[PDB]
Amino acid sequence: GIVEQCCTSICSLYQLENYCN
Amino acid sequence: GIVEQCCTSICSLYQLENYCN
Amino acid sequence: GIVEQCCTSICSLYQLENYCN
Amino acid sequence: GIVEQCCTSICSLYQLENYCN
Amino acid sequence: GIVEQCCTSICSLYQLENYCN
Amino acid sequence: GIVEQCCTSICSLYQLENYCN
Amino acid sequence: FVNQHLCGSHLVEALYLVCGERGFFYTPKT
Amino acid sequence: FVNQHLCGSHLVEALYLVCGERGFFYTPKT
Amino acid sequence: FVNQHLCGSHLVEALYLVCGERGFFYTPKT
Amino acid sequence: FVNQHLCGSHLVEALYLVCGERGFFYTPKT
Amino acid sequence: FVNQHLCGSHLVEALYLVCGERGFFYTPKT
Amino acid sequence: FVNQHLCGSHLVEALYLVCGERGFFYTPKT
Ligand SMILES: [Cl-]
Numbered sequence: 001g002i003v004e005q006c007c008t009s010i011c012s013l014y015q016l017e018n019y020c021n
Numbered sequence: 022g023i024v025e026q027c028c029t030s031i032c033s034l035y036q037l038e039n040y041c042n
Numbered sequence: 043g044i045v046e047q048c049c050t051s052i053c054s055l056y057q058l059e060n061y062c063n
Numbered sequence: 064g065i066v067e068q069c070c071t072s073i074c075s076l077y078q079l080e081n082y083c084n
Numbered sequence: 085g086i087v088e089q090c091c092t093s094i095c096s097l098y099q100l101e102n103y104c105n
Numbered sequence: 106g107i108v109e110q111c112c113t114s115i116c117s118l119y120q121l122e123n124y125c126n
Numbered sequence: 127f128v129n130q131h132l133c134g135s136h137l138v139e140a141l142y143l144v145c146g147e148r149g150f151f152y153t154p155k156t
Numbered sequence: 157f158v159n160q161h162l163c164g165s166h167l168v169e170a171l172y173l174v175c176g177e178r179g180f181f182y183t184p185k186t
Numbered sequence: 187f188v189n190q191h192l193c194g195s196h197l198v199e200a201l202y203l204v205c206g207e208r209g210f211f212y213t214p215k216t
Numbered sequence: 217f218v219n220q221h222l223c224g225s226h227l228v229e230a231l232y233l234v235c236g237e238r239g240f241f242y243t244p245k246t
Numbered sequence: 247f248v249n250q251h252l253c254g255s256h257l258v259e260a261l262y263l264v265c266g267e268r269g270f271f272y273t274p275k276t
Numbered sequence: 277f278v279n280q281h282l283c284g285s286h287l288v289e290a291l292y293l294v295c296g297e298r299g300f301f302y303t304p305k306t
C-alpha cells in the first residue's frame with residue numbers, strides 16, 4: 001500500500017499521485 | 022520571486038523544482 | 043464540505059472523524 | 064511524562080488532553 | 085499575549101524563549 | 106554538512122544560522 | 127476536544143491525527 | 157479516534173490540535 | 187523530482203501537495 | 217535570528233524548536 | 247500535479263518534498 | 277535555546293524559522 005510504497009520503501013511524487021482521487 | 026508567487030498567487034511543483042540545487 | 047468548513051468556519055475532531063476510512 | 068506516554072508508548076487523543084491547561 | 089502577538093504582529097525567538105519551561 | 110551537523114549530530118539554532126544566506 | 131480552524135495542509139494533519147491507522151479521505155470541493 | 161506514536165514536534169502539534177484555546181504544557185522532562 | 191521516505195504525517199502532507207484539489211485517500215491498511 | 221510571524225500551529229512548532237528539551241507552555245488568550 | 251498555494255513554512259516544506267536529496271535554496275524577496 | 281536533532285523537513289522548517297527573510301540553502305550533499 002502507500003506506506004509500503006512510500007514510507008518503508010521510497011517513492012516519487014509521481015507514484016504519490018497514484019493515491020489521488 | 023517564487024516565495025511571493027506561491028503565497029500571493031499560485032505556483033507549480035515544476036516552478037518549485039527550479040529552486041533545487 | 044469538511045475541507046471548506048474547517049477553513050472558512052470551524053469544525054470539530056468529531057466531524058473530522060467521519061472522514062476516516 | 065507525555066513523551067513516555069505518547070511518543071515512546073502510544074497514546075490516544077483523550078490521553079493527550081491530559082496535558083491541556 | 086505571545087500567541088496573539090506572533091500571529092497579529094511579529095515576535096522574536098527571544099520572546100518565544102520566555103515561554104520555555 | 107547541515108545534515109551531519111544538525112540531524113545526525115545535534116545543533117543549536119545559532120549553528121542553524123550558518124546556513125542562512 | 128476543542129473546535130478547530132484548519133486550512134490547507136493543517137486539515138490533513140488533523141485528519142491524520144484523528145484517523146490514525148484507519149486513514150482517511152481528503153475530498154475538497156471542486 | 158486512535159492511539160499512535162506522537163513524537164517531537166508532532167507531539168506538540170497534536171497537543172495544539174487537542175487543547176487549542178485551553179493551551180497546554182509540553183514538559184518532556186516530566 | 188526525487189524519491190524519498192515519506193512517512194506518517196509527512197506522507198499525507200506530500201499527498202496533499204501532489205493531489206491538492208483532486209483530493210486523495212490515505213489507506214495505510216491497504 | 218529574524219522576527220517571526222507565526223499563527224496557529226506554526227507558533228507551537230516555533231516554541232518546540234526554541235525550547236527543546238525544556239518544553240514550553242502554550243497559553244493563548246481566552 | 248496540481249498548482250499550489252503556499253505561504254510561509256509551507257513553501258519550504260514543498261521545496262523539501264520537491265528537491266529531495268538535491269536540496270534547494272529559499273530566497274524570499276527583501 | 278537548545279541543541280536537538282533536526283532532520284528532513286523539520287530541518288528545513290527550522291532553517292526557515294531561523295533565517296526567514298535572509299533565506300537559506302539546504303544542501304544535504306554538502
Ligand atoms: Cl498557515
Ligand SMILES: [Cl-]
Nearest residue numbers: 164166284286
Ligand atoms: Cl519524524
Ligand SMILES: [Zn+2]
Nearest residue numbers: 136226254256
Ligand atoms: Zn500553516
Ligand SMILES: [Zn+2]
Nearest residue numbers: 165166196286
Ligand atoms: Zn516529522
